[PDB]
Amino acid sequence: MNIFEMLRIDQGLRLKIYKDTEGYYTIGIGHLLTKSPSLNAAKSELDKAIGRTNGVITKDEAEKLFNQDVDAAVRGILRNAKLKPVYDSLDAVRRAALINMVFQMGETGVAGFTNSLRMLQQKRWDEAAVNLAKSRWYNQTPNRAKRVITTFRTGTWDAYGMLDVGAASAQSIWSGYLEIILSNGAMDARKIRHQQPCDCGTLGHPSPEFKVYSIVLPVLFELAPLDGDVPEGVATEAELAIHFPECESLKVHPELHVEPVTNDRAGVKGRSYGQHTVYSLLRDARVFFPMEWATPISTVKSMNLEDSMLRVQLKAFCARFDQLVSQSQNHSHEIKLVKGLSRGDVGRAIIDAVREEQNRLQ
Amino acid sequence: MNIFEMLRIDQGLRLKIYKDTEGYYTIGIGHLLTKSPSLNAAKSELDKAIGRNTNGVITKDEAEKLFNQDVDAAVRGILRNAKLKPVYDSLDAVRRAALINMVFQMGETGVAGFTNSLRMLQQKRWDEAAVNLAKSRWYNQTPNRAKRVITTFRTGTWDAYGMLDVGAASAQSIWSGYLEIILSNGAMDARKIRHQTQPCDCGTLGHPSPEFKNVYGANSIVLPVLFELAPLDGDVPEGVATEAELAIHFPECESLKVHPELHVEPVTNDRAGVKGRSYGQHTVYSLLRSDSDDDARVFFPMEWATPISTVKSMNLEDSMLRVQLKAFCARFDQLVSQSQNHSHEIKLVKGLSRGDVGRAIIDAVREEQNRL
Lengths: 362, 372
Ligand SMILES: Nc1nc(=O)c2ncn([C@@H]3O[C@@H]4COP(=O)(O)O[C@H]5[C@@H](O)[C@H](n6cnc7c(N)ncnc76)O[C@@H]5COP(=O)(O)O[C@@H]3[C@@H]4O)c2[nH]1
Known about the structure:
By secondary structure, chain A is of the alpha/beta class.
């Protein structure tokens, strides 16, 4: 990964205007806008900052805004006599770890770590990591401090997972659900149903009678917002924009669904698995596909984890989910995980995801 | 907890006679019966220990009676040992169990080898001793058990034997993702009983209709409680039990019967972009009603807690799975108990093994009859 992923995990990312801890309007990864109590005043600074917003900005814009902050923070480091020698000595990864401290505490704050910085400069990682864990910075935010400290000691991104909650949930959804339905048959073999009776065909080849409504995609889209912002329930067309931001032509078809897979498990006869609602996008001909949200994400959110820990586990969830997908045999391109930093980012990620699945078939 | 749960996690517990690493017949928590290769000799030796006709199958309270007999004998040998008596006497109750844990694993002569580590414990240098113990071969050979025993020495608490544990995530999984969803429709007693091939005015769990009592008995009673079975070793049966296979699924659950034709109505809900996902259609089980010694029965809905089966598929080390599943029951009971309107609608049946669950089910169902 990179320094951007590091701070999104440790600090978080917001693509809507929010009030920070002291109440001042901020965007992206902790980018201060104004000390004015006028929501419009901050928006005016935001509009000129990107040159476009209505208070909402995109992912690659927030990463463009982040790099502007990164260079300015590095600029101040070179202007600070206590932080210049250590930065010059550090390697690429450990430079990001020091930059994280400046983003959290300010250049004046990081300069206070006189003893800890000298141990880093003399490449005494174990010695420095023990001293950093004794500070007030560690006591205030130990989850973030542990990962930044672990980054200094080892120089790797390893802190950012066999017994992780996120990887266990990715293991939970694959073995306890997706593997069951995939064992039944192929995705193109899965029958399409109307809530009417229709011989509506299958996902791979929709029947000519179905073509009332065009192509249908035999791909299960599993949506994973990396901030855990999953909408509850299923959206009606009125609420569709609330559930799925920035999906231009998206529509929801409650009356159509993919047939569920019946299983016997844990003392339950005919447990229903993998019943999907069919959604469409503009291809006025449209593209129908079955998609659903990654349901462990909603449950892990209910555990009330610390915000950075929730982002850490969801990051492990997607990392292992893709790995299990890569090792999948005889089920090539049937499961696609749509990853987004926020719920809105998923909406834009859905559009390209469906386009790339069309191109492989067409 | 206590020393019994500590060793039950670290070593495991068996209620059937088994051969240990060296081939000797054993019961409970590493309790040697005989060095004879004759299974009958071991069964007779077990009978003399318990004062019963066991045939090799033992209960929890019997295995804990045998465990404390090993504990006292192990403490006695320690007090007879000049290298271990000063350190044992200085330690507190919890840290004493940790020292007893090492004796159970490697023997008094083995534990006596830790000359440097034991002296740090005697003069209360916890952090220093925990670092020195982690340098031994005992740590490299058995790292999961050594880590928990070392943490017990360092902190003097049972915290190592079960905040974001894998077991608690699965316990949150079943509560937030299933049980809470089903209960959001209404109370458990309001849930209707359904027949497979017919329409039956069968009533609800809280109020069984007169037609239901016509088919299954005029003294039949139905409990509006969902019994969630939790085997603490992860032994969950595959699939659903048939009438013939009932004994395999539920060992030593006396008079148990299964009614495939009866089921609790499923709850349809909207989740994760799914319209009307079907939830909680349960199989109805019955037991003979000890209330009135008759043929009248007690009907209840029962199923296994399937995250236990899911957690097993992650291929954890035996002791690590026991730690996580114990955390699962701790978080599952905590979530159920703290509910403000669903406290006695869900009852979690905990057992040390699958056989232990079979006897635990009866106690659970009898306990619900008296409450209602
Ligand atoms: N999109 C989707 N469609 C499904 O049909 C489905 N079924 C399961 N899952 C998810 O895969 C994983 C399988 O784990 P498990 O079954 O052990 O725990 C489940 C199980 O203990 C219980 N549960 C939920 N739904 C059912 C059900 N229909 N039958 C029996 N038990 C259920 O509650 C737990 C959490 O369910 P979800 O939190 O919604 O997510 C599960 C889970 O993350 C599904 N995901």
